[PDB]
Symmetry: D2
Subunit: 261 residues, 4 copies
């Protein structure tokens, strides 16, 4: 019943938001942006990402929906001309919910900060060279030296992960995927090169070697952390829920976005 709508803030998106609010006024639907059950995002994937983070403390109580006013988004995958048909079906309800895994990032100091990502979490150096020891379930795997690392959710595999050579994986797979950014590899320095796909309950830990200052990005929020002792990655126990009103399979979403629509 409760719902809210975020807008990219351009003219196209604000007006669509006002028309859907007016349309919702004709049903037993209450606009509440403090404890919504339905969160509608109008813009692009960036706008959907912002809506996710705005409500990340009530993920289990919310079903998300993305409307793309521009080109197709991987998250905002319904067209504005569908808005009225969307208002109807939401109002009635009785829709199915679809869940995607999320990535948990923990940053320890010398204290602890955790973040939830829908696309990916990346780490780079704050200026100096990036050198980190990569530990998988407490086993020292490799010493990474290069530009940085990117740890992706399944639904993020079509975003930054894709541009770094990562594999695309179906979002029903509870996993995370680590890809390299420009690693150095010579007689002295050696990384695996290949992307790595980790299952639930595996912990990947980055440990500093020299500099302890890192720029850490969660989705498109980039934050400089100082005095870093460890960055820990693992598939979250939390999941994001999408209201789904029709079949739009992931691989078809992939075909439409990258091959031809």
């Amino acid at each position: 019943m409760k719902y809210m709508i975020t807008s990219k803030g351009d003219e196209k998106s604000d007006l669509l938001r006002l028309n859907m609010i007016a349309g919702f006024g004709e049903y037993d639907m209450e606009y509440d942006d403090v404890e919504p059950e339905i969160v509608i995002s109008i813009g692009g994937d960036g706008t959907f990402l912002s809506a996710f983070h705005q409500y990340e403390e009530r993920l289990d109580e919310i079903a998300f929906i993305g409307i793309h006013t521009g080109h197709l988004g991987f998250y905002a995958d319904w067209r504005p001309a569908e808005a009225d048909k969307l208002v109807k079906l939401l109002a009635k309800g009785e829709y199915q919910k679809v869940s995607y895994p999320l990535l948990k990032t923990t940053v320890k100091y010398g204290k602890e900060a955790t973040y939830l990502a829908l696309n990916e979490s990346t780490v780079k150096s704050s200026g100096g060279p990036f050198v980190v020891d990569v530990v998988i379930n407490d086993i020292h795997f490799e010493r990474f030296r290069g530009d940085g690392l990117c740890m992706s959710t399944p639904s993020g595999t079509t975003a930054y992960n894709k541009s770094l050579g990562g594999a695309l994986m179906h979002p029903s797979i509870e996993a995370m995927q680590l890809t390299e950014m420009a690693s150095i590899n010579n007689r002295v320095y050696r990384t695996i090169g290949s992307p790595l796909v980790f299952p639930k309950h595996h912990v990947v830990s980055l440990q500093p070697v020299n500099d302890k200052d890192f720029q850490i990005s969660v989705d498109h929020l980039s934050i400089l952390h100082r005095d870093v002792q460890e960055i820990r990655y693992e598939v979250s126990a939390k999941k994001i829920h999408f209201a789904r009103f029709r079949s739009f399979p992931f691989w078809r979403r992939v075909h439409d976005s990258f091959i031809e629509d």
Copy 2:
């Protein structure tokens, strides 16, 4: 109780086999290569692969063990000097079993042949250009034109898959991964490029466009199929079982094989 041992057939491996048979003679163990419960492979990964295919019709009744007489194998991951300690622990039994997913390939004609793979199944043209339509769960995904395609199990991701840019994935993930071989991409021709990771119950189907003759390889068995109507890939319902006597984690096996041992 029943068991058998395959050997690479060189002097090192035959002698180790004879010594383990002699060692087994000192326990309630019967050498039976028709209905073994324990299959021991002595050689390299190729030798383990051959042992897998020799007994693929009794996978649920067999626990496999690989001994590497040469360099570390991903499947033959115990050292010859461990043979006597291996005979002991097998004899007693009471070991844990570890299962890895397998890949099912179906080839249809104008009749049907199916194959089980532990590493991967690849398709190439019998001489002409390789052009196939790639259909994912009955959705036309792309038209692939190039050298060929490779579909990998999780434990195969460190084999051919790795050399083609595929991601490495932990074998506890019930999935298969498709990688391209030298795809052409220009104004007229368009593939996804990225590896694709499919979950259980997804069906990837290759459909010929012009030539219907393909060289299909399952592990390192390469067979020319004529008059091909479809090649269908999916995670098998069958699994391979390994007798495990100690912890040797996959990511540590990966580190030892590729980073440094």
Copy 3:
């Protein structure tokens, strides 16, 4: 004055050929397919490649021209609607000539065969594993184990070379470029991975390690060589000459073929 025209042999291309012959009949131009000075290819890049090889023994006496009846070719880069304007300017003559480097392949036995390539020369195994020692100017560089190797001219860098990760290089650079096909890289096996760009007068030599039978392709002619002692690559001293009637820069040809036309 002397000239000839090859055709892809479909209806579109044969008719264009007949109309250009008729058009040439109106000038001091003689159709001679034994000692042409102007060779016109009507079809696609494959048709231009065949025309190149048909006359590779008179490369210094011939200027080539490609007309693409289908999509833009990198070699057949003029449109059929330009045919009449082409006949005119050829007839008069006084056009500029443009030269592209070529690749020389030498195959030695236990005797010698040499081949000239306009796109590339590739080597693969005749069935077994491909293992070759790579020697650069008599220095042992690496042992390559994998699917095969591809050695490209500059103008071939947009063809097979491109699909294997090679760099695109401007054809005014007298060089050749070696790219890997699916090399194995682990503790035991080590290749450079990166494409290699060699200047004029450098000799790259492939030397067999075990099997001496290789499938060698020059452009799209694939030939099984038995009892191979060495394959030697070097930039040819010979060059292919194009009649050029207007500016169509390589990088613009690249943009039109791969980015958008």
Copy 4:
């Protein structure tokens, strides 16, 4: 006759410098760090890079020599134990000189700054997304959106260029090579992907689309430029000269650094 020596500043390198100065005292050699003819760098490639930039205004009057106190450098390719044999041969002189191409970067504002690079020049965004139009000899080639671009000299192709997928090219080739950093490629955005190798006299120009602030790195000097109108790349007319006392071929240097020494 005039010469100077730079040191990494650790104990190993300072002492080697003092011993070579003492050794030079026994010949007609004058220590002059204002107008040297011979510049000796003792440290690693970073130390050689700093020596290059210290004297980039007298490149035509200087022959450089690199001594590596740590692992082999691509520029500092002589061993400390060779120092005394080095002092001798320098003193006499009569050595051959070897020249490598350099990269010229021009940055225009709304004024002009130029820089010379021995390894590469890279461009990234000052925080926002990196979006630049890539113009080759005044032809609009592509719109690049992603992490950044890297433009490499031939001798830089084994440095950052290598980690980004670039080809390795022999330094006798007067060229520069452009590689992408994590480009986005989907229905809306399209780059060539492949590295590009440009000959002498080609001009690659980056032109801003939205944000005009870029972090530009020349070798390992990273500088934030504001109010940028254009970045222009081209092979320099200037060259760096190495004193060479024996054969150490580039491809052997490549083998030693990456394959095995």
